[PDB]
Here is the input.
Amino acid sequence: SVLASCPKKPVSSYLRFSKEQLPIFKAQNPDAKTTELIRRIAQRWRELPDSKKKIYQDAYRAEWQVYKEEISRFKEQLTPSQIMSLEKEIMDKHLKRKAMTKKKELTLLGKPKRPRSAYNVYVAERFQEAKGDSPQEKLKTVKENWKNLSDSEKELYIQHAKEDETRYHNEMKSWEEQMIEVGRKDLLRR
Amino acid sequence: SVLASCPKKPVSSYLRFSKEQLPIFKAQNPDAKTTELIRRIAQRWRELPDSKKKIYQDAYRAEWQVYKEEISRFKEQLTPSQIMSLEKEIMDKHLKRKAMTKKKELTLLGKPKRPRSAYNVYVAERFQEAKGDSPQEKLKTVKENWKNLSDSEKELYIQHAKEDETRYHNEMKSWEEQMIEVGRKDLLR
DNA sequence: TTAACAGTCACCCCCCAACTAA
DNA sequence: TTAGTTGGGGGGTGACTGTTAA
DNA sequence: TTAACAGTCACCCCCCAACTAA
DNA sequence: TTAGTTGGGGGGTGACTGTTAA
Ligand SMILES: [Mg+2]
Ligand SMILES: [Mg+2]
Here is the structure.
C-alpha cells in the first residue's frame, strides 16, 4: 500500500541494456532458453565499448537524481502511521522471503516430513472421490464425512497415522544424525 | 506503545506457585542464587499433591475467562493504525529477542571482534582528548577533526589498522576450528 | 550482501479445515 | 501458540543466466 | 516453540557518525 | 544497502534455574 506507492530505485547500467536486448535476442532465437540469451547479452555488454556503456550509466546517474528527490519528498509527506506501515510491509516481505528460502533449504537437505495425522490419511485416501466443484468445496465434504466417520473406521486411519509417527521418529533420527555430521547442529530439535 | 497497554495472558499454575514462593525462599535463604531457589521451588511443585496443583490451575482457568474478556474489549477499541502498530511491536520484539540470542551465543562461543578501520583506531586513541561533555557530542568533534586530518598523518593510523587485522585472522582461525568441533558450518561462510 | 531487469520452469503459498509436534 | 501436513486450483516467486552499485 | 513469573549477572541495544566487508 | 566496529551514557534483556499450555 504505502510500499506499493513508494518510489523505486533506478536500474543500473547493465540491466538497462539487458531489458532492451532480451526481446530482440528472444525474437531471433525463439527455442533458445533465457539463460542462453542472458549469457550472450552479458558477453555483448562486456564486448560493448566504454563510450557506449557510459551512455547507459549517464542515464542511470541522471535518474538517480530524480529518485533522490522523489524518495525525499515521499518520506517527508508520510504520516507516523504510514511510516510504521511502510516499515511493517518491508519487514513482512523480508520475513516471507527468508521463510520461503529456509523451507527450500530444508527440502534440499532432505528434511523428513512431519507426521501425517489420522485426518491427513483420511484426506489422502478420500479427497478426489468426494463431491465438490472446487478443492475448497471438496475439503468441506471430506471434513463433513470425517465427522460422520464411525469409530471402527477411525481406527483404520488412527493405525496408519501411528505407523507414520514411527516413520517420522526413525527418519528424524537419521536426518538429525546426518545433520550433526554435515556440521548443522543448529537444525536439530532443542 | 499499544503492546505495553495490551492485557497479558494469565500465568499458568506452576508460575503462580513460583511467583508466591520465590519471596519466601529468598527471605529464608538470602545469600542463595535465584537459580538454586527456583530449582528447589520446582521440586516443591513436583512434590505438591494434584489436589493442591488443581487449586492453582482453577485460579488460572478462572483468570483465563477475565483475560478473554479484557483482550476482546481492548481489541474492539483499537484503531486500524493501532492494530497494525501492535502487530508490528510484537514482531519487532520477537526479532530483537532472536537477534540478541544469536549475539549472546557468538559471545559465549568466544567469537572474535571483526577487523577495525583507520577511522576506528583513530577514535579509539583520541576520544578521551576530544572536547565535549557527552559521548555523542565529544565523538562529533573527532569527525570534523578526522576530516581536517591531512592524508600524510592519516596514513599513520592505516598501518596500525592492518597490524590489528592479522591478529583478528589468527583468533578467527582458532575459534573456527573450535566451532567445527561443536559442529556448526552455520556460523561459517 | 542484495535489489534492480526478464522468460521459463518447478517449487511454495494462499485459501478451505482439522490435527498436532515443537 | 505457530507451522506443517493431507488435497489442488490459481495465484506468487527464487534459481538460472548475467552486471552494477546502494 | 515460546510467552508467561522473578533475582542476578554479564552483557546488548541505540543514539550521535563514518567507514566498509558482505 | 545492512550490519558491525570505534566511544559511552542511559536504559533493556537473555541465560539460568524451573513448568504450563496457547
Ligand atoms: Mg507463491
Ligand atoms: Mg540475478
